[PDB]
Design a protein around this ligand. Structure first.
Ligand SMILES: CCCCCNC(=O)[C@H](Cc1ccc(OCC(=O)O)c(C(=O)O)c1)NC(=O)[C@H](Cc1ccccc1)NC(=O)CCC(=O)O
Length: 297
């Protein structure tokens, strides 16, 4: 029982040893293509790479590499693509992947600059009259509208393949207040945002996997996925309390290394998931409380 485990861990002061244990047991799979010298310019960090077995392959004959991994949750029936924050030369690759995987949504949980340091390129357009063209991938991206909230912004984007001329609506969900190596301000804020992502349709199985990213594509992004996936499980078990969060995280760590970067992010996923279960269980008003508590305005 989740809650029961959570308290025992908390009362026993064991978040760090439980977290170190997860790291110690995570899967070790090769990241050979990501390490090829010619892809060094495609990697934001030297110690963060996609496993060979689950990486996303660009459909270029030229060079199919993108530091991105397909996290496929069989029991939850949900797939996610987790990627680092694109670099100046991978903005086209990033959009080529969104297009090739049929993603309808993009979840960004970092800010372009954090602590004065640069974490991701400005890969989408900031003004509607200033659209972006990715020459290398023959794509055009246009900002269609944006809804700014106090800690997040939802943007409506139009991605066009210039080769075939088809256009697609891409929703972009941007969490602007999640510190690096940190946790959202509260479970309510987190959940209010996640439920926004779920209600947009983006995560539906008739579309490609949603794209999640932060600067490395592992801490913040792992956190968001573990809570989303645990909640889906709690809603399909009907013995919701048997969802074992450590086990779900180790399953996801088989597809991408380092998911969840601090013990505190692990502990927050437990708080988020337990608070989110109120909704699963049947509380028809906890959602409006999260919106109120999140202070969207
Ligand atoms: C899994 C192992 C990584 C843990 C230690 N590594 C780091 O902090 C980062 C990777 C990283 C991981 C999670 C993050 O999100 C946190 C979140 O979302 O909560 C962020 C992030 O957002 O900042 C950054 N890598 C380096 O700094 C390398 C360390 C290094 C340096 C030299 C050789 C080998 C490793 N430097 C770089 O890669 C510099 C770039 C270069 O030289 O190409």
């Amino acid at each position: 029982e989740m809650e029961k485990e959570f308290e025992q861990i908390d009362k026993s002061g064991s978040w760090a040893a439980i977290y170190q244990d997860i790291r110690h047991e995570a899967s070790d799979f090769p990241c050979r293509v990501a390490k090829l010298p010619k892809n060094k310019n495609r990697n934001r960090y030297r110690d963060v790479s996609p496993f060979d077995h689950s990486r996303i392959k660009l459909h270029q004959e030229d060079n199919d590499y993108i530091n991105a991994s397909l996290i496929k949750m069989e029991e939850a029936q949900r797939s996610y693509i987790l990627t680092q924050g694109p670099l100046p030369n991978t903005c086209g690759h990033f959009w080529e992947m969104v297009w090739e995987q049929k993603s309808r949504g993009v979840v960004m949980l970092n800010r372009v600059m954090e602590k004065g340091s640069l974490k991701c390129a400005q890969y989408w357009p900031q003004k509607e009259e200033k659209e972006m063209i990715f020459e290398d991938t023959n794509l055009k991206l246009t900002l269609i509208s944006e809804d700014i909230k106090s800690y997040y912004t939802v943007r409506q984007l139009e991605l066009e393949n210039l080769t075939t001329q088809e256009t697609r609506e891409i929703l972009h969900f941007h969490y602007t207040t999640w510190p690096d190596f940190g946790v959202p301000e509260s479970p309510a804020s987190f959940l209010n945002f996640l439920f926004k992502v779920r209600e947009s349709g983006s995560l539906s199985p008739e579309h490609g996997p949603v794209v999640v990213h932060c600067s490395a594509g592992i801490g913040r992004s792992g956190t968001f996925c573990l809570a989303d996936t645990c909640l889906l499980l709690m809603d399909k078990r009907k013995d919701p309390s048997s969802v074992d969060i450590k086990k779900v995280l180790l399953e996801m760590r088989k597809f991408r290394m380092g998911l969840i970067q601090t013990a505190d992010q692990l502990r927050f996923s437990y708080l988020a998931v337990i608070e989110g279960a109120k909704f699963i269980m049947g509380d028809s008003s906890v959602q409006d409380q999260w919106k109120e508590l999140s202070h969207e305005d």
